Structure formats: structure tokens, C-alpha cells
Write a protein that binds this ligand. Sequence first.
Ligand SMILES: [Fe+3]
Ligand SMILES: [Fe+3]
Ligand SMILES: [Fe+3]
Ligand SMILES: [Fe+3]
Ligand SMILES: [Hg+2]
Ligand SMILES: [Hg+2]
Ligand SMILES: [Hg+2]
Ligand SMILES: [Hg+2]
Ligand SMILES: [Hg+2]
Ligand SMILES: [Hg+2]
Ligand SMILES: [Hg+2]
Lengths: 223, 225, 228, 211
Amino acid sequence: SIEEKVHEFESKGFLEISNEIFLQEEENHSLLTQAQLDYYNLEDDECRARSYSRYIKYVDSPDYILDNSNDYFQSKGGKVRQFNSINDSFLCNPLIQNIVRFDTEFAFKTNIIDKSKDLIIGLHQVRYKATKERPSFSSPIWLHKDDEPVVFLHLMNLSNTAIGGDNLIANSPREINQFISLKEPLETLVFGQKVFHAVTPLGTECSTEAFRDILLVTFSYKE
Amino acid sequence: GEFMKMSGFSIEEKVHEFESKGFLEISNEIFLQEEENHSLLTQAQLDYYNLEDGECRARSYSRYIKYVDSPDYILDNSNDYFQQFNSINDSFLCNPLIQNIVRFDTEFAFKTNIIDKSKDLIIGLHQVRYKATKERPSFSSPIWLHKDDEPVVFLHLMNLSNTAIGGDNLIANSPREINQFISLKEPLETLVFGQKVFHAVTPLGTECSTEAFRDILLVTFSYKE
Amino acid sequence: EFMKMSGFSIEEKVHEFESKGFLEISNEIFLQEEENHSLLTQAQLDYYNLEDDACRARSYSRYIKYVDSPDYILDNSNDYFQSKERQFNSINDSFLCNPLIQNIVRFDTEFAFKTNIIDKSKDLIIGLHQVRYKATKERPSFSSPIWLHKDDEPVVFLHLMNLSNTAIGGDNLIANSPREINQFISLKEPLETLVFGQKVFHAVTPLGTECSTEAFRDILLVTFSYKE
Amino acid sequence: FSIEEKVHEFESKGFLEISNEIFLQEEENHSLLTQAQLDYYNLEDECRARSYSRYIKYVDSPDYILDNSQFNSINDSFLCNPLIQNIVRFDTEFAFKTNIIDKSKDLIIGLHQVRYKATKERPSFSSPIWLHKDDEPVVFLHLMNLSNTAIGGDNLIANSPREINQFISLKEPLETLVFGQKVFHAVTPLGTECSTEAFRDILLVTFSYKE
Ligand SMILES: [Fe+3]
Ligand SMILES: [Fe+3]
Ligand SMILES: [Fe+3]
Ligand SMILES: [Fe+3]
Ligand SMILES: [Hg+2]
Ligand SMILES: [Hg+2]
Ligand SMILES: [Hg+2]
Ligand SMILES: [Hg+2]
Ligand SMILES: [Hg+2]
Ligand SMILES: [Hg+2]
Ligand SMILES: [Hg+2]
């Protein structure tokens, strides 16, 4: 069903993917737990804590090469604003490796990404921290497009005290066309640049800290 | 000073916090002290199924004028307002709970430095029913952070479907930051806005196959001219 | 045109219900027309007309299906006898003729008749129970019996009609025996449906609210039992 | 604080709801709660997984001591946790201030670390399943963690087994419920409508007599 799903993404600019596809084997539930626990190890860089690492997919190679460099710049002392690398235990997790393969194989079946070019596969580990006096928000705060032509948003975990963090789709900034709320681990939303998207701020009306753990898998060309 | 015993009206205490912050959350406890307010609330809620309405929301508008002379509320026969919607039904405006909410809002407004008790005031009432569907989210106008034209605005939640998601309120000192996140969930929970801060309400959605609602009542205070 | 039959077969669904004793049904089968959304709103608003009991409010009406007649007639009598528990208000005519309600009843009847549980050689009572559970912070809403049980009728359809956002609880439990809970079902959106047989026990968790206003759970029961 | 009228209310009602604000007065407590919340993934197994550890308070002894005289024992890291020691200290101070706990007999302060695991095909339920009174005259229920996918797990208070009088839903970490034997209570089964496993992580602090 990848053909009709890929075609749907190309026509709409976005696609909802349910988490059941990554939850077929019973062992995946324990692998998910291990991936989820790594988000308590992310070090703080205010509203959110994140880690970044990237793979290189050379044109004819079936393999993924973890770049020793993790510099991120954005289309836009302390100029580079470099981030910590993703823990090895997270990248070696077979569930994480299987997710990126799905993301990579799906990306290659779009007309957006060509298989005759060197691709950078970006992995963004983000933990949004929300507090009663300090809600979490992104930059940009409203509707926007990501630098990378294809982006996968995978929910990893969501505190029961969290409010917000809903995803918006807009063909243009004058009106919202779709409202998607990720609730279960591994629910997935794929973004293209044909539409703007946004994430609603994360809040809590509780005395404890609310969190929203997400994994971004982006696809862009090298140099 | 600390707190009050039993009845904790503390309107002056509330006003000081409102002017100091630019916004204020008010509990529904003050509007639900009489046992018939629960049945009057039900009648007010049922009126939102009569709002008629681009299918994002259904609206009705009416306004009162409070002259400096006496402390009365005069139902204006114009109802003209540019961002012409239907007037609010007579059964809704004569509902004693709606009148008591309006009265509570007016005396709160007059105790601010913003509202001149020596100017003729327009008390606007906006009855809004946001409608949301799985293929159609509902959003406000303006869509994002903004300030309203009226110096003091009361937002009263009237009803919220259990299938509704979103519709959370944001408070921002500037358009680059979110400083406070308030999600009204119980009927008659109130938010008062000043112009010292920006606000917004996130879009309303549903992951369910049925239609979701968010029913609000806005009470605005502005000078006639 | 040439179209495909989707969802699941009613004979297949009946087989699962018979082996399991219970069956969860999605609201999609009752929401195939856009007018159904309008009919749902009218049905939902009727629950604000139910009178208070003398932990909840309810109305009852029933149809009779005689074995030797294709017709279904609205009984003028509405006496409901429940051992260890007189009169009940009848369901408003506008609710019973609401095309969405009629379609639910006809779906339930067609499902009940295709089970081996219902003996087609007896006169049937098709009972309709319109129930609004009301919960407040000082008085949660509980039923009688309060825990696991079997209903008097061999086949019962539970249709969720409405649930206030301030309500907590009201979850459905399935137990093969009173010693263990086997399944947990939470009816969330309207027209979500759960069908019970007498092969298993069931219960509904109490309804509560931590809010200062009244919380509601609007239910429709369609039961199938023998006239005599 | 008010540790006087609250004990009277608990003695009169048979149960009492305590907010988590008293356990989260410092910002260091938030980090300790996370450490205690992370220890529930180490619990070994089924409807639920649990660990048990207890302290002995001798009448002549001036303080309670960890007993080292059946499930696994609670990890030392969880017991070394100052926030966990503060909760137990608060529980003991409250329990001792009641007229239900006899100060002439040796007291057992029991700690039950329980993780309720619920899947779409297997709900999680307590034993006993329905209204009951616990063996111990005073029991403290502390919520430690609750998955966002979880449904149920609501607490019921009943004067008799035929009625529900109070309905309490613990939702945020360290919210607390105290049970006496003057009323019945129960916890509704734990379920999920989601494809993932849902958890309800709890800490019980019970006071019972040695003999
Ligand atoms: Fe983005
Ligand atoms: Fe506004
Ligand atoms: Fe029943
Ligand atoms: Fe117990
Ligand atoms: Hg920020
Ligand atoms: Hg690795
Ligand atoms: Hg809270
Ligand atoms: Hg719209
Ligand atoms: Hg839903
Ligand atoms: Hg509430
Ligand atoms: Hg779910």
C-alpha cells in the first residue's frame, strides 16, 4: 500500500501513518521502552532539549553511514549552536534502525527525493519540557516549512499532564485545513513543503513537569 | 492580609492581579452559588443549538449601553459590529444567569483603571459556537496572537464537547514567546483579557467521527466613541 | 455502478458475538449519511427532557413482534418488572420516529435475529431504554447491580448517545467469571456500540466528575427478550 | 501544612485526599521524583509487577528501621531517594498523629511499589477487584506515574458495598489518598484503547501491627 500512500503524500503534502506498522513483533514493545527511556538522558541546551546525528546514504550503497560530524546550521561566542550527538544505545536500537529504513524507503519512492543523489538522513531527538509557569514553544512559533523537503515526525512519548502539542496543516496562513493530534507512541506524520505546518504550544495545569518526546527523520541532499 | 474566610470574592484582589498581569483566570464557583444557576446554565447551553451559520462557527451579537447617569443596562436596537450578525435571542438575554455574569463583569471592569466610570460604555455580548469536524478544523479570526479592539474582554466557556481537542488559550508578552497556557474545560470558567498582553486560541479539532463544539460567551467593554 | 461491500459481514460479526459473548461495534455503520449528523443532534437533545427518578433518569418503550406477523407494533403498556428493585415514562414519539433511531433499532433487530441465541419460535419484546446518568462531585452515579452481572434479556445493545466532557468513568467491563476482568471497553464518541450476551458477565464503572457542574452519560439500550 | 484538622477530617470521613504541592516545595524534588519514576521500569513481573520492603517501629525504639530479617525487595536507590524518605516520614508522622494507630504495639511500615500494566487485549485489575477494606488500619496511596494512554484506575469511596459516595481520579504524580477502615474503597480496572502498553505506577505505605 506504499504506492497509494506515497501518491497521497504527493497530492496533499502530508500524510498520517498509524503506529501499528512498527508494532507487529511483540519484542518491539520492549524496544520502544528502551528508546523512550533515552529521552530522560537528553541534556539541556529552556523550552526544549534536543540531540542530533546524521547518516549519509551514498548513491548506490544500501547502507547508512553515521557521519562523525553533527553540525546543523538551518536555512534561517556561541555562533554554531552545535547540539550533542544522539546516544549510541539509541541509534543501535533495532526499532530506531527499522524506522529510518521505512522513512528512507518511503522517501525514495516519492518524486520529491531522487535515488541518483547523495542524501543526508537527519535524526532529531527532541524532548519538549512544559511547566505551569513556563509553556514550551518552537522557533518558528506559528506556521512554517522545514528546510528539508521531506520530514518524518514520530511521537515517542507524551506525559498524561501535557496539553497541546497538536499539529496543524495549512495550505496557506489565512486558514487551517487539518488538525492532527498525535497520542500514541510511534504515530507518524510526514511533511512536505507544499503546505505550511505548525505545532501548538505545550502546556500543563499540573504541579509536575509535562514532556513530549518526538523523533524527527529528515531527508536532504549533501552539498 | 493573607486570605478571606468562606466567601472569597476578593474582587479588588482579583483586579490588582489582572492589572498587574494583563490577564486573569476566574473560577466558575462564583457563578454557581445558587442551585438554580445549574438549570439556568442548561438553558443557556441549549440556546447554542439555535445559532445559524465558512461553517467554522455560528455567531450572534447584541450590546448594552451603560450611561454615567444611572447603573442600568439598556438593550441597544442596532447590534451593528464590524470585525451584521443576528441578535442574541431574548430568552438568552433575560436568563438571570447571563444577566448576573454581565453584572459581575461590569463591576469588575469599572474597578480597573482602563474603564472610565464617567464615560458612556458599550457592553458587547458575543455568542460563538465553534464547529469542528475530522475533515474540518475550526479556528478563530484573527488566526494567531493578537489584541482585541476592546480594552477589557471576558471570555466565558459555556460548553465543550468531549470529542473536542484544541481550543486552548495562549498568553504572550510579545509575538515571539508564549508565557502562559490556559485551557478552559468546565462550563463558566472565565478568562479576562487586557491589552498589556497578546492572546490567541488554538484551533479546534476532533479525532472522532462526530461533530465537536466549543461554545463561548464574550463580554466586551469599550467606549461608544 | 459497481461498488464494493466494506466493513465486516453481519453473519461474521454474529459468529464472533456468539463465541465471545460480547461484540464492540463502530459508529461508522450508523454514520454513512450526512443527514445522520443532524438526526444525532436531535436525538441527543431529547435526553434533556427526561424526568428525574424517584442515581439517574430514564424512559422506556417496547415493540412487540408476533411470530405469525411481519409487523412490529409500539406497545401502549410500558411496565418493566426487575426482580429485587413502579411506572416508567414512555419515550417521546419524536425520538422513536427519528430515522437514525429507527435505523439503529432495525440494525439491532437484524443482528439479533441472525444469532442462534434468539429463538424465532417465540413472541419477541424489543425494549428501548433511554437513560441519562447524572453525576456530580458530591454524588457519583451508580447502578443496581453496582458490579459484574448479567442482564435479564439474552441480547442487549448498548449505544452511547452523548457524554459530557467533565464526566469520568462509565467504562464497560467484560468478565467470563467474577474472578477476573477479561476485556475493558470505553465508549467515547457517540453511536459507539457494545452488544452483550448472557454467556459473560459485564459491568459499567461508576460515573463521576471532579468538576463543579453536572456530568452526563446518555445511553440507549435495545434489548431482545420473549413475550411469555 | 495544617497537620491537625486534616487528621480529624480523616478520622471523621475515613479517607482523605492530600495534594502533591506539599511534596513539591523545592525544585530539587522534581529531579528526585523523575529518579523514583524511572525505578518502576526495573520492577520484574501478568496484570501487574510489584516489589515489597518494610520498616519496623518498636514501641521502645526511637525511630523506624529497615527490616532485613514473596515478591522482590524495593531497590536501595529508590529507598535512598530523599523524596521517598520524605513521603514515608510524612506518612508516619500523620499515621502516628491518628487515634487509630496503637502506640503500645510494634508497628510495621510497609512499602508496596506496584506497576499496573494494561494492554488493549489484557486489562489490569486489582485483587480484591471490588469494594473492600484493607487489612492494614491506615494505608497511603501515592500516585507515581500514569501513562497518557491509560483509562480507568479511578478510586471509589463507599460507606457500604451498595453505594458509591466519592469518586477520586488521581492524575498527577505524588497526589495522595489515605484510606481508613471506616469506609470501603476500590480501584477501577486499568485499560487502554491504544496499541501501546499503559502503566499506572503506585506507591503504597501501610501501617500494621507486628503482632
Ligand atoms: Fe517543523
Ligand atoms: Fe480575542
Ligand atoms: Fe447492565
Ligand atoms: Fe485496598
Ligand atoms: Hg523557546
Ligand atoms: Hg549505533
Ligand atoms: Hg493538573
Ligand atoms: Hg473557517
Ligand atoms: Hg476518537
Ligand atoms: Hg475539573
Ligand atoms: Hg487510543
